[PDB]
Write a protein that binds this ligand. Structure first.
Ligand SMILES: [Co+2]
Ligand SMILES: [Co+2]
Lengths: 111, 111
């Protein structure tokens, strides 16, 4: 229920200096994201394929849901790590607005 | 990326007889759903609380993400079981449209 990383960058955007300070970590996260999203799409495709061929529960369905679950969990965890990277690159006085947005979105299920 | 159960009921709604045949299983799923959504909200709240008090990675963050991941996986699995219950309660000649919607939505990541 919400793209946490995009919510943060939109609601409390980095200032000019912070954008420079975080450039490398933003690049590395964008790549990590992508990689995990690739795993996630493949897992969804495997689930869809299993069910298209055999429209019933089977061990392939159980396994594909486990694979989806873990890839989604991995993306949530990698995104949180990068959310803390961003917080580290903020001016300290900007952290309270950041925390307001972060906590509120987490409570709503944003990842 | 999509409420699979709602997508099915909207795109290929049950006919009058099928609605009657599936009434019990729809009631039981609505309840199971709710229960799992309760777990999910609590897990999100725990994650938000951990991070509101300690804005950094900790074992409480790791654990809360594991709890979210498993509750989301459980909801996906329970929803699939109920999706197969619905398919069982359809007239056989309605299953091809149902499968079209189901497979297409799964491929897109709907749960
Ligand atoms: Co960022
Ligand atoms: Co239903």
């Amino acid at each position: 229920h919400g793209d946490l990383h995009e919510i943060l960058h939109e609601a409390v955007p980095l200032d000019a200096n912070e954008r420079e300070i975080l450039e490398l970590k933003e690049d590395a996260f964008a790549q990590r994201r992508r990689e995990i999203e690739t795993r996630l799409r493949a897992a969804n495709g495997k689930l869809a394929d299993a069910i298209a061929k055999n429209p019933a529960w089977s061990p392939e369905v159980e396994a594909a849901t486990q694979e989806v679950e873990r890839a989604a969990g991995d993306l949530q965890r990698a995104t949180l790590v990068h959310v803390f990277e961003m917080r580290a690159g903020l001016k300290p006085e900007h952290r309270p607005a950041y925390d307001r947005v972060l906590i509120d979105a987490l409570r709503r299920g944003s990842q």
